[PDB]
Structures are given as structure tokens and as C-alpha cells.
Write a protein of this length. Structure first.
Lengths: 899, 899
């Protein structure tokens, strides 16, 4: 006893009080906060690195993969096999490869070539070198990573010191070595820390695991932290495993008050002086040597061995941590001591043995107590995160020291239970611990890799090549011809109807004109004053009127009676009733023009059911209603198509404009054609603006080779199945539906919304052009995109969001391109029509998709350029082709009945 | 009365209850939250746009500028002059330019050319067209801007509808028009909303202003909101004025429950149907017309004028908001009514006049009450932000309606005082209101513009051009020659000392060597085992030892007695005492080599003061101490320079290495020279590694033309004034000091830290290489950089941070370049030395600045490439040139005494 008491005082500084431990527990808690915070992270010693592991094995894990484990006591290679069974275990085998101490102090190159050399042999000796099995990599060192399969070595720790690796990506470095040999082919799908592997390996057997603890050569702990606490990782949903890297605890001076002269000497003779100061007070790679130093000091003071000092006792590394354990055994502790010490050349006395055994006890007890303190900080942290008064969790443990020291386990648990009282912690030990762990993470990594490989293949069908685009342009052009020729027009799908607008405005237009814009329940009347002065100027007014459904489904005699009623109101509203004014009539329903002022209605749409209108000439129905009133008289000069109105509106300013285009809910285009070509209208002189009605392009199957399964579904479920095939791959009314139908598919395959098909996802037209234009916005953050989706009614996650945005993108790009191939055919036909080799033409466009969408117009333009280089086409957003345009068509109209 | 009562019931829906108003107040509060939040902002109708105005006039405002005001009742141009006086007012004049109604409905082009045309005239008529005065621009429309001098028109409101402007930057569009004419030159320094101008114009006279309220043609309110609440603007310090754009309140349906059939008809006949729904219930541009519609409906029902309806009463725009005011005058209200109505063709009865006057009252009272409600929401918001129980603030008001209606002011204040009770609000009216406002913002904008112009000029001196760099390279080369030649060596500043290392390792090296690394209080001894096996392998160990200051300032006999004591310890530590081992001696103090194993100490540094060492040969002092002990014997084979050790260490692996470089606290470089050239050492055969000591380059004034005022200050205040000029523009020991000296300067000029010179800013060496390497980090966010600074002890702001980072950048770039020009001279001399036209050489480098810094090594490399294209130089980070290197020099040493 006297002896033991003499050591206790000598090593008093190595005997920490609970008061002290709690303090240390508190200091670490602060180091944890700083490392997580984005403000102090820059200069924090406890790195708290994100592992990018968001959950423990859910069981659904299955596969066959390899696993490397480098950085611990020994370098082993495992082949883990997690398969499907009826409550039966998982199989796995491992092999340890000797790694020369002069190899971990060499060049990164030699080291990774060694690891590669050992890998190939392992697979070959098992001849599984053919089936490229996924490879997991457990690397126990602080690594920076922004994804599971990347690992930038922050620095080396423990006994490694290979140059040319720090600051580099070990995965690339390994892939580099595996290549150099080319003996085989490896798939490093993931890189994980050993603490992570341990937590995984044990969480598999216990879904309560949230902490991985390593206590061996080195020491470290990882836990499950709230994303909303990990400032340096964008997100807020779920959890992510954090790699504290607590071995560096104190590397900034925080622990100088508890470190002794022996601790500092141990540091001076170390590979990484000044680093991992806490670790050097705890882990097994240092325990043995720490005791030796204490023994040398004592012999030197004649406190032990009667001052006798031998060359062996002074040689670094002669007293291993394994002697510390042998000496602390309950049974043969003191006998082991005598043997060990004796082997050191010393001649120990019974007193010497007891003393040396108490030094061991004091040194290893400190290790235990210190780790209880820091682990307790992680427990309190978990207790706070869950807001629970008492904590219940399972800790995954591993490490040569913890597993082989006879007293560590017990002392560690005892002290821990005394510092962190309101909690019941379960400690699960693991066989390989990080062997099966890297496998579970690899498993998930592979999984997500296939999902992406698949998703990429599905979206590939939407990728049109410049050659396909040329065919599309080729085919559109042929369709155009069939519709112009008189011999095939009746059977053509791209009708190419004549608008009877023989000239674009020339500036000579001057006057006051009325326009009627009818295309729904809310139509409008307008007054447009045009002054052909020195300076072109046009002012206008307009009021909107409603059409009671009762009248929409009225008798056609009431419909036009009501409309003239509204016009009668407007004229008074503008204070201009009296004179016989000219009026342009924009009729946005399926019509067939037989003259500038005549158009037969082929079918009602948008809810109109007025009787005795279909088949009749709308302009006559209007003229008849006007006369029925006898209050005033108008001179209906024309019936107008809004697309044609859009070009006219544009031509008025930009004279090189001879093409109009609409890309909104629907799509159409027009252009000035040569009369000699309009076989449907007598006269080979002059020009004629043609209203293509190009949305029917492909209605005879000519696009059937570029349409996808989702294009077909959208058609199958559309109201006009088999019709408007082209407009269905380009208009804002369907784009969302192609998108929605892809999402449903992916949801079923389980790549989105947890495989759960939402009711909102089942609703058609949920993805309007407005919301389609947002999700793809450059100025939007993924957290906003996610908000938008959730706002629609989709329980999307940051991850879902990334997916939905990609799909949208794929669909809208093809839309713009397919639109470009179309537009590309028109301009070239115009060029060739006039026998030119270079054409400069402007196009007037309108439409909520072209206008609101972030990338449609751009990609569209890029495309027309590639497919039609002999043409220099310019696109100008021209609005109100239905009002201003109809008026301009009217002004040009009256102007021409004079010539 | 009966009449009045008959109207009250007829227009019951226009009479809002306080219950209703408070509800609306609450709805707006929610619209304010959504617009500010990054989650709901995407689809929010109340945009809550950031104005980038962080404070009201602080008085320090002074200058002479112009101001444009477009978008309100009239387009005026002001020339405001805010100067320094003894409590006397500010001067300003304005001029209104007629803007044709057919001009605000035309093209953006014509509109901005009109504004330009009006601008030039204004300045010319005042002939101030010569002095390019700053120009302020008040544009009253929702604009997107990320900086004061940018304004992307979201959309048009009120009566503007010029095409080609929405979605574009009006500033560029204006600058575009001012150019087209080129009559003059304008400086649009800022663009502000009218609400902002009003708040500014009134905050100037009252530092309590936090709200700008407009009630005229249109209606809108801006206030001062907490940056920590403006999710869409990075930051958290101070305040920023938010432009609510509340006219759009309800544009999503939120107010359909309080809008009447008259409100909806007013919308149908509007320019922007469906937009600014709230505004259309309040502002002056609509009040008049809203009453007309109510009157038409009543006549039609024979409720007024005995049902008589006239063409005038039905003409839109015949009843102006100015008639609403005339009619509500206390004195001549009913007489004004009779006159007005009569002018409308109606024949009003006294009863009719009373009724029409009550309609006005009911309509204008609603306007007042509605704006009280929404303003009250902004007050409650301000009360909450300041956490005060009762609110005290000043509101800046303006608007034709508010200023000209006889009853508005009174009704508005009354209702407001009843809804928002715990607060005293001061209402300041402004003359031009936005005239003097745009001027105060312009003032500040100009100010910051000059600071940047200045700062840019100061940092320009640090910009070296490729030609200067070539001169530097030219001069370095000449310096090199003077130092090699025997006739000028004694007077050369770049000493070019011979290291006596005649060969780089060749691989033949094999053995066990000791090294002593002495360069401070903590030196180390090392054992390096080198095996020239089939595979190159080298393992080593080392312990660190301290030198008590008492011994550092000892007698030189004790210093080397102590060192040999440490070596004696180490040999036992490694268990190898006995044999006579070889030892390399790295002596990192000002030494002069006279042989491979001899070096005279020219002067102590780093606190050493040991006596009788200076002038003596350190290797002899060591050999003498060894012999004094008689415990063992060593074979000191060499005295080493760490730079030379760095190259050797590198050559060992990369055989093309013949140049070493150190860039850390200090800087030096070495390279293999041709013996025929080393005039200081006999023998024209073989080579000789030269230790340049290039830090003294420029010590004779040869760099005096590229050194700056701050370079001189750093020298002036350095411990070795006039010496190490080159090393002072490149080493990590001074870079921070050049930086710190610039900051102090800028602080004085008042461009940083509020002109306040911190005590921390006065501390030298505050900017260590570590912190210099961080601030410039690509992976760091400005909020972190700011944290770092504040962590140093600098009360920096996000803005300060942006500045400090730029300075650092300027300084560290020149450092790398100046280093490159130097390195560039060595490689070329080697090339030319061997008469080659292409040279491939590797350079071994080390140093905390080169290693830790984000951009040093890169820019350095880029530079050596440009200046030395006949050379293909490769840079390899080679570490431990002081230990491993000293050993390699020793191994090569013993190996050569055999040849
Ligand atoms: O091996 C246990 C631990 O040792 C520490 O030194 C390393 O930095 C960690 O990566 C590792 O988890
Ligand atoms: O003119 C007053 C207000 O009118 C609103 O319609 C505009 O959108 C605002 O920019 C302006 O502040
Ligand atoms: K986060
Ligand atoms: K024809
Ligand atoms: K903010
Ligand atoms: K010579």
C-alpha cells in the first residue's frame, strides 16, 4: 500500500476529479458547437466533419461487395455479402495484408500501389476479379468530402506519413494506382471513416444506433446530428453523421492545464508534434510509451529498480500498450509485470512490480475517464437534440485498446454512468465493425447509382440530335408543300390556310379603327387610333366584356346579339357613337377563311355551344346582329387569326418581319408566301400571308419515330387523341403533362416522393406554364423550388426537387428545339421561295411559354441558327396581335380596296 | 337626409367597418411576411422589393446634382444643390416637361429618347451641360435591382405602357438614349422609387423618418426593415428600405370580398386588367372614374337626374378626381356639384347635387380608410421590430390626392389614430418630396464612387506589368553575376554563397545518418535510415528538444554542451549509442560557408545571445563540445542550409530537380551552378549548389522604382531597415504588414472601420500567413471572412470585409509575381549556362505561404511560364529539407570522400 500511495502523489496530476472531468465535458461541448457553426468552423480544432451518411441500415440492404480498411492497427480486406434471408445472418470474410512501417512513411504513390497490389491479389485469390464488385473504403483519417465517393485527406494521424497525399483525393489517388496496373477494375463507390463504419455495422443490428466510438491505435467518435445544425451543409431535413475528429481536441492549448510533462515529451518524440494532443493522452498507440517515460523518470530518481537504468528501458517503443494490459490482469498481473520488466534487463523487486502495475492503472484509468467525459458530451448533445428528459441510445464501439484491456471497459462504463446520469446507453461491440459498415454504405451508394443510370437512360429519348432536327425540318417542309398544292391540300394535315392578308403595314396607315377580340367568356372591344405622321404613333383603349354561360350555350342569335350589345356600349363609353367605323374581327376558334371578311366556324371550343353557328360564316352572323339592332352600322373589314395579327403588329415597326409565331397554351405560325405558290387562291401575282395551323404536324404519323412513350400517353389521355401531335410536344398546355407523366413513372419505380403517388400528382394540368417557368429559373434556390413544389401539394424533398427540375429541363429543351426545327423550315422556304442565298427576316412572337420561360426562347434561337444558316432571323416579342394586330389588318384592308 | 340615407344603403358595400379594416390590416401583415420570406416570395403579390437604401440623410450630404422624376402626375426635372451652411436651407429648381399620352403608350425607345431630349434641353437652358453633374432618377414603378444604379422594370403601372422596357434595365435604356444623341454626357448614379425619395426628402428634416407614403395618381408605401428579415438580401447588419408595392395587394383574389361591381368594371376598362387591384380602389387616377360609373348606374335606374342619361355622362374620363375634390369642399361643395354636373349635360336638382356629393364622400372615404389600414400594418410592423410598447415614428407623405383633397388628410388621420392606438406618428409633407430625395441618395452614391475610384488608384501601384517583371528578372540575373564573379562579390548584395554540395543524390546512397536541426529554442535530432535497395526507401525518427533561454543567452560553451547533451539522450532514445555515426548539421542562422563542414556565424538571431560563437566556426564549437563529453564520437560531415536541404530532398525522388525554393516567414533559393562560374572556389570542373540568399536583392536600390510608399513604410519600421528589400515584398513575414499599413491609410481616409483606427490595427504582425491564407480562400463566405476579422479584434462589417480581402489579394499577387520573376531568372541562367534552347527542370519548394496560400503557388507558376518560355519548370512541394535533407547531404557527403 505504502508503495501505491507513493505513486498516487507522484502522479497526482494524472488523477482527474469528477469536477475536472465535467469541466472537460463542458469544454468539448463548446468545441462541438464551434466546429458546427459556420462562424467559428474556420479556426476550430474539433473539425466536426460531415460524412454524408444520413441513416443507418434499414435492412433493405442487399448485395455483394468488397471492403478495404486502412489506417488502423492492421490493413485488412473484406468481401461482405448482405443478402435476403428469413431472419438469418450475413456472410463475410477478411484478409490482413502486412504493410511495412517504411511504406506508411513513404510516398503516396507507393502506398496506393501497395493497396492496389493487395486488392487485386485478394480478388484473384478468390477469382472474383471478373465481376466488378462495388468497393467500399474505410479510411481512418480526417477527410474533407462533399459526397460519399470523394475524400480529400485533411492530414495524417496515428502512424501514417506518406507524402503527396494530404490535400488530395485518395479515391482518385487509388483509382490512379488501380489503373497503373490495370490488372483489374475496381468500383470505389464510397469512402467512410472507421467510426462511421462501426456505427453502421451496429445500427444494422440495432436501429437505435446514433454513435460510433473508436478506442484503439487512435481514438475518435461520430454521431448523428441534426441537419438544421450543420451550418456547412445546405439543407434542413433529416440527419447526417458527423465525424468529430476529437483526437485534435486541445490542439490549440485548451487542455494544457491537464497535460503533464510526460504528455509533452510523448508529443516531442511523435511524428506529428503538436497535433492530436488529446488522442496522445488516450489511444493505444501511445499508452505503452507513456508508461515507459514515467518509468525512466522514476528509475532516474532511484524511485524504482533502485535507480538501475538499462539501455532497454531507455529505448523508445520497448514497453508496449499490450504490456500495460498484461500487467493489469486480475490473475497474473504482477507475474506478468516481473516477466516483462525482467525482459527489460531490469531486476524487479516485488515492490517494483506493484508500483509499475499502479503506474499502468493510473495511466489507463485516465484514458478511460477522459473518453467518458467527451463521449458524455455527445450524449448530452443527443439528449438536447431530441428534447427528451432522459436519454436512450445505443453506442457502437470498437478499438484494440477497449477490446483487449482487461479493465478499460469496466472503468469506462462506471465513470460514464456517473457523469451522464439521466440516460441508459447500450454499448454494442462489433466483430470487424467497419468491415460490414463500409458495405452497408456502399450498398446504398450503388443503389442510388443505378437509379441515376436508369433515369439518365429514360431521359435520353428526349435528346434530339442535330440530324434528327434536320429531318424534322425536312418533314415540316414537305408537309407545307402538300398543304399549298391544290392536288393534295384536302388530305394534308398542315392545312396552310390563306389569311387573305396580301400586305404587311407600310406606314401609310392612318385612321380610327375598332377591333373585336373574341376568344372566350371574356372578349373585348377596342378603339385603335393610327396616325401615319412624320413620327409613327398609335394609341388605343379597350374594355373587357363577359359572355354569360347561359348565352355561351345560347342560340347563336343571342350570342351575336349580346356581342353587338357590348359594342354598342363601348362606342358610348368612348363617346364616339354615330359614324360607320371599320372593324377587325379576331375570332379565336377553329375557323376556315374563304375571304378576308368571311370565315366559317368548323367547331366550337372553350365551352361555347351557341346553336346555328357551326358551318355558318361568323362575319355574317355579326353583320346580321348589327342590322337587327338598327342603332348603328359598322364596316366589318376583316376576320382575324391572332397569329397573323401578331406578325402584322410586329411588321408595323420592324419591316423585315414576315413570320409570326405563337408559343403559349397552343402554338401556330404564319409567314408571307408567294401567290404563285398558293394554289388554292387564283392569282400568281403578289403575296399572301399563310396561316399554317402547324400544330397538326405529325398527325399522320410523320413524327411517330421521335415521339416517346410519355408523348403517347399524353396523347392517349388527351381530349383530342391522335390530333395536334406537334403542338403537344411544344405547347405550354402539354409540357407539364409530359413532365407529370414521367414523375408518376419515376415515383412508381420509387425514385421520387418515397414511391408514393400523390393525389396531386394524379391531377392533370397541375404543372402550369407559370410554375414550369419558375422551377427552371436561374434566380431560384433549390430550397425555394422545393417550397414551390410543396406549395403545389407535393411532399417533395430537396432531393426530389433536384429531380423534378431536371425532368422539366429535359422536356422544355426539346420543345424549344422541335419548335426551332419548325421555324427553321419556314425561313428557309421563304429564302428559297425568293431564290436567295442569304435572308434577313424578323419574326414576331408572343405566348406565355416563350415569354415567361427562362430558357425556351434562347435554345429556340440557337436552334434556328444551326439548322438554317443561310438565314439571319431575328425574334421580337410582339404583343396584342389580337387587338392592335386586328386593327392593323383592318387599316391595311381599307387601304387596299382603294388600289 | 333622406337622400343621403338612400345612398348609404345603395353603396353599403363601400362602407367598411372597423372590424373589416382591422381584418384587412391583418391580411396585409401576412402579405408583408410572405413577400419578405424566401419561401413564399416567388408567388407573393406584395413584392416587398429591396431598394438598397440603408439610411436617411445624415446631414453630411453636400453637392450639386440633377434629378429626373418620371411616372407620376407630371414629368419634371430638378437641379438640387445641397451645400454646407450655418443652419440655412438647400437650393433647388424644377421644370415640368409635357409628355404626350401617346408617348407613354409607345415604344421604350421613343420614351427614353424623349426623356433624354428633355434632359439635354434642361441642362442647356441652364448651360450646365459642361460640368457632368451626377444624375438621380426617380422612377415610380416596381423595379428589380441588386444595386442603386440598376433598375429592371418588373412591370408598368398607372398610365404607362411603353413596350420593350419591361424586363429591361431602364438605366441602360436611358444611357442608350443619351448616347444616341450624344448632345451631352449624363451620370445616372442612382435610381429610386418615389416612396423612397419622399422618405429621404423628409428624413433629411427629421431623423425619425422610417416610412415613405405616396397617395396620388398611384399609391405605394416604403419603410425601413431589418436586414435580418430580408431573406433575399445577404447580410444581417443594419436596415434597408423596402418598397412594398402594395398597389398589387389583392391581385391574387385576397380582396374579392371587399371589391364591388364598380371596382371590377373599373378594372375591365383599365390598361392593366387584373393588376394593382388595391390601387384601383384608392389612387387618384381612378377615384373620378369610379364615381362616374356609380352615377351612370344610378341614372340608368332613375335614381338620379330623373333617369336622364347624356352622351357625356357615359363617356369615360369625363368625371375627374379633381371634381370629386371640388364637390367635397366645405364652402362651395354643392355649388361646384351643380356646375360640374350641369357641364355634363345633365340638369341637376338640389337633391341630385347632395346625392352626387355623398357618392364622392363615400368613395373618397373608402380610399382614406383602406390606406389607413395598410399603413397601420406597416406601423405595427415597425413597433414589433423595435420591441417598443408604444410607437413613435415620422411618416413622409406626398401625392396629389392627399395634398389636394379637402377632406382626405383629416379622415385618413382620424381613422388611422383609431386603428393603431399605442403610437404617435408624425406626418411630414414634402414640396417636391422626391426631388430632394433622389438627390440625397445620389449624393451618397457619388461619394462611394469616388472612394472606389481612389482605392483603385492606390492599389494600381501594386500592379506589375509583364515588362516590369522582365526588368526585375533582368536585374536579378545581373545581381547573380556580380555575386559569382570574384572581382565584385564582396560588394554584391545577392551573395551567391557556395554550399559545397557538388552533387544531388543519385540513389546510390545507403546508410544510417544523424541530423541536427538547429534554428530556434526548439531544435531536433534525427535518425534517418537510407536504403539504396531495388526500391528506394527511407525511414526516420526524431525528438524535439528545448534550449532554456538561460542557455540561449549562455556562454556558447554551455549552448553546445547542452546540444550534445540532447544528442546523447537521443542516441539512447533510439537505442543506438556506441558507434561513430555521420551527422549533418542544419544551422538556420546567418552563416558563411568556407567548406562543406565549416561555417562561420556572422550574427545571432531569434533571441540567441550565446557568447563567443559569432565569428567562430559552429562545426568546431560542436566538435569541441562532443570531445568535452568523451561519452561518444560523431563524424560531422556537413553544415547545412535548409533551402539547400529542400532541393536535395526533392532531387532524391525527382532527378530533374536542381533548384530549391523557400517561401515562408523568409525566402531563399538555390540552384546547381557550373564550377567554371563559381569564381570564389578553385576548380572549373563539376558543379556547385549555390545558396543565393536572394532576399537581399534590391538592398542597393535596384528595386526602388517598383517599391511603393507602403513598401517603404514597412522597411522604415522594420528591425533591419534598408536590408532584405526583396524578401520584404515576398515573405509571409511582411505581406501582412504591407496590408495592414494600407488599411490604416484607408481607415484614415475613412474608407474602412468608420475611419476609426483600432488598437488591434496598430499591432504589428496581426495578419499572420495563416489568416492571410484564409481571408483569400475560395471556400470562404464573406460572412465568415467578416467573422475571422472580428475574431482578430477588428470591428469589421460585411463591407469592410470585401475591402480587406481585395487589398490582401493585391499584395499576395505581386508577391507571387515578384517571386516568379526571380525564379524565372535562375532557370534561364541554368539553361543558358548549359548552352541549351529548351530546359526541363523541377524545383523543390517549401514554406508556409507557398503551401497554405490559396493562390500564391498558382500565380507564381503562371508567371515563371510567361517570363521563361524556353524552360519547362516543374514545382514540387518538398518538405523537411532541414532533417531529411541534411541527412541526404550527409549521405552524398561520405559517398564523395570515396571517389
Ligand atoms: O482510428 C481512430 C481515429 O483515429 C484518429 O486519429 C483519426 O483522425 C480518425 O479518422 C479515426 O477515426
Ligand atoms: O406613384 C406611386 C406608386 O404607384 C404604384 O403604382 C407604383 O407601382 C409604385 O412604384 C409607386 O410608388
Ligand atoms: K444546414
Ligand atoms: K395561285
Ligand atoms: K438577410
Ligand atoms: K572556379
Amino acid at each position: 500500500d505504502d508503495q501505491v500511495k507513493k505513486i498516487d502523489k507522484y502522479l497526482y496530476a494524472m488523477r482527474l476529479s469528477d469536477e475536472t472531468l465535467i469541466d472537460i465535458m463542458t469544454r468539448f461541448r463548446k468545441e462541438m458547437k464551434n466546429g458546427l457553426s459556420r462562424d467559428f468552423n474556420p479556426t476550430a480544432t474539433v473539425k466536426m466533419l460531415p460524412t454524408f451518411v444520413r441513416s443507418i441500415p434499414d435492412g433493405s440492404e442487399k448485395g455483394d461487395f468488397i471492403a478495404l480498411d486502412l489506417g488502423g492497427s492492421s490493413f485488412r480486406i473484406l468481401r461482405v455479402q448482405v443478402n435476403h434471408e428469413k431472419n438469418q445472418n450475413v456472410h463475410m470474410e477478411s484478409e490482413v495484408y502486412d504493410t511495412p512501417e517504411n511504406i506508411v512513411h513513404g510516398s503516396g504513390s507507393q502506398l496506393f500501389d501497395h493497396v492496389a497490389e493487395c486488392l487485386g491479389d485478394f480478388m484473384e485469390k478468390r477469382k472474383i476479379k471478373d465481376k466488378k464488385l462495388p468497393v467500399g473504403f474505410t479510411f481512418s483519417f480526417p477527410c474533407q468530402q462533399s459526397k460519399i465517393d470523394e475524400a480529400i485527406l485533411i492530414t495524417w494521424t496515428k502512424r501514417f506519413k506518406a507524402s503527396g497525399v494530404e490535400g488530395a483525393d485518395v479515391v482518385k489517388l487509388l483509382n490512379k494506382a488501380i489503373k497503373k496496373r490495370g490488372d483489374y477494375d475496381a468500383n470505389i463507390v464510397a469512402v467512410v471513416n472507421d467510426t462511421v463504419g462501426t456505427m453502421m455495422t451496429c445500427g444494422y443490428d440495432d436501429q437505435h444506433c446514433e454513435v460510433g466510438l473508436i478506442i484503439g491505435t487512435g481514438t475518435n467518435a461520430c454521431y448523428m446530428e441534426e441537419l438544421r445544425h450543420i451550418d456547412l451543409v445546405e439543407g434542413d431535413e433529416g440527419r447526417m453523421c458527423i465525424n468529430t475528429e476529437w483526437g485534435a481536441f486541445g490542439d490549440d492549448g485548451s487542455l494544457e492545464d491537464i497535460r503533464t510533462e510526460f504528455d509533452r515529451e510523448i508529443d516531442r518524440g511523435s511524428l506529428n508534434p503538436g497535433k492530436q494532443l488529446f488522442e496522445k493522452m488516450v489511444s493505444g498507440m501511445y499508452l505503452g510509451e507513456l508508461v515507459r517515460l514515467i518509468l525512466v523518470k522514476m528509475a532516474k530518481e532511484g524511485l524504482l529498480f533502485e535507480g538501475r537504468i538499462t539501455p532497454e528501458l531507455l529505448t523508445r517503443g520497448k514497453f508496449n500498450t499490450s504490456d500495460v494490459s498484461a500487467i493489469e490482469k486480475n490473475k497474473e498481473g504482477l507475474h506478468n509485470a516481473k516477466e516483462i520488466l525482467t525482459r527489460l534487463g531490469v531486476e524487479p523487486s516485488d515492490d517494483d512490480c506493484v508500483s509499475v502495475q499502479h503506474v499502468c492503472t493510473i495511466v489507463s484509468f485516465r484514458s478511460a475517464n477522459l473518453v467518458a467525459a467527451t463521449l458524455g458530451a455527445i450524449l448530452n448533445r443527443l439528449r438536447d437534440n431530441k428534447g427528451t428528459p432522459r436519454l436512450r441510445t445505443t453506442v457502437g464501439v470498437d478499438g484494440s485498446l477497449y477490446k483487449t484491456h482487461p479493465q478499460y471497459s469496466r472503468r469506462f462504463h462506471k465513470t460514464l454512468r456517473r457523469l451522464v446520469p439521466d440516460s441508459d446507453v447500450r454499448f454494442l461491440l462489433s466483430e470487424s465493425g467497419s468491415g460490414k459498415g463500409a458495405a452497408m454504405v456502399t450498398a446504398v451508394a450503388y443503389r442510388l447509382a443505378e437509379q441515376h443510370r436508369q433515369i439518365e437512360e429514360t431521359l435520353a429519348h428526349f435528346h434530339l440530335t442535330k440530324d434528327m432536327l434536320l429531318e424534322v425540318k425536312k418533314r415540316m417542309r414537305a408537309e407545307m408543300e402538300l398543304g399549298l398544292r391544290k392536288q393534295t391540300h384536302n388530305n394534308a394535315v398542315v392545312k396552310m390556310l390563306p389569311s387573305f392578308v396580301r400586305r404587311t403595314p407600310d406606314g401609310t396607315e392612318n385612321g380610327d379603327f375598332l377591333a373585336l377580340d373574341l376568344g372566350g367568356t371574356n372578349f373585348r372591344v377596342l378603339l385603335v387610333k393610327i396616325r401615319s405622321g412624320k413620327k409613327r404613333t398609335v394609341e388605343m383603349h379597350n374594355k373587357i366584356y363577359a359572355i354569360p354561360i347561359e348565352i355561351m350555350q345560347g342560340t347563336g342569335e343571342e350570342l351575336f346579339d349580346h356581342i353587338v350589345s357590348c359594342i354598342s356600349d363601348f362606342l358610348d363609353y368612348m363617346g364616339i357613337k354615330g359614324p360607320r367605323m371599320p372593324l377587325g374581327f379576331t375570332f379565336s376558334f377553329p375557323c376556315q377563311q374563304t375571304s378576308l371578311d368571311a370565315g366559317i366556324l368548323i367547331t366550337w371550343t372553350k365551352g361555347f355551344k351557341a346553336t346555328d353557328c357551326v358551318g355558318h360564316d361568323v362575319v355574317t352572323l355579326l353583320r346580321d346582329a348589327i342590322k337587327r339592332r338598327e342603332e348603328f352600322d359598322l364596316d366589318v373589314v376583316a376576320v382575324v387569326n391572332d397569329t397573323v395579327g401578331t406578325m402584322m403588329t410586329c411588321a408595323y415597326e420592324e419591316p423585315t418581319c414576315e413570320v409570326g409565331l405563337i408559343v403559349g397554351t397552343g402554338s401556330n405560325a404564319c409567314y408571307m408566301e408567294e401567290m404563285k405558290n398558293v394554289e388554292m387562291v387564283e392569282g400568281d401575282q403578289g403575296q399572301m400571308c399563310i396561316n399554317m395551323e402547324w400544330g397538326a404536324f405529325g398527325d399522320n404519323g410523320c413524327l411517330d419515330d421521335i415521339r416517346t412513350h410519355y408523348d403517347r400517353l399524353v396523347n392517349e389521355y388527351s381530349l383530342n387523341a391522335g390530333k395536334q401531335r406537334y403542338e403537344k410536344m411544344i405547347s405550354g398546355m402539354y409540357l407539364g403533362e409530359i413532365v407529370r407523366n414521367i414523375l408518376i413513372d419515376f415515383t412508381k419505380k420509387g425514385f421520387l416522393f418515397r414511391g408514393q403517388i400523390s393525389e396531386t400528382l394524379k391531377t392533370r394540368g397541375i404543372f402550369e406554364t407559370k410554375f414550369l417557368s419558375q422551377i427552371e429559373s436561374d434566380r431560384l434556390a433549390l430550397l425555394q423550388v422545393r417550397a414551390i413544389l410543396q406549395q403545389l401539394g407535393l411532399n417533395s424533398t430537396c432531393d426530389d426537387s433536384i429531380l423534378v427540375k431536371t425532368v422539366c429541363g429535359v422536356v422544355s429543351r426539346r420543345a424549344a428545339q422541335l419548335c426551332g426545327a419548325g421555324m427553321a423550315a419556314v425561313v428557309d422556304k421563304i429564302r428559297e421561295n425568293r431564290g436567295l442565298d442569304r435572308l434577313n427576316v424578323t419574326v414576331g412572337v408572343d405566348g406565355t411559354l416563350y415569354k415567361l420561360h427562362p430558357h425556351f426562347s434562347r435554345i429556340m434561337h440557337q436552334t434556328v441558327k444551326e439548322l438554317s444558316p443561310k438565314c439571319n432571323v431575328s425574334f421580337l416579342l410582339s404583343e396584342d396581335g389580337s387587338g392592335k394586330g386586328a386593327a392593323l389588318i383592318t387599316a391595311v384592308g381599307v387601304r387596299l380596296r382603294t388600289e
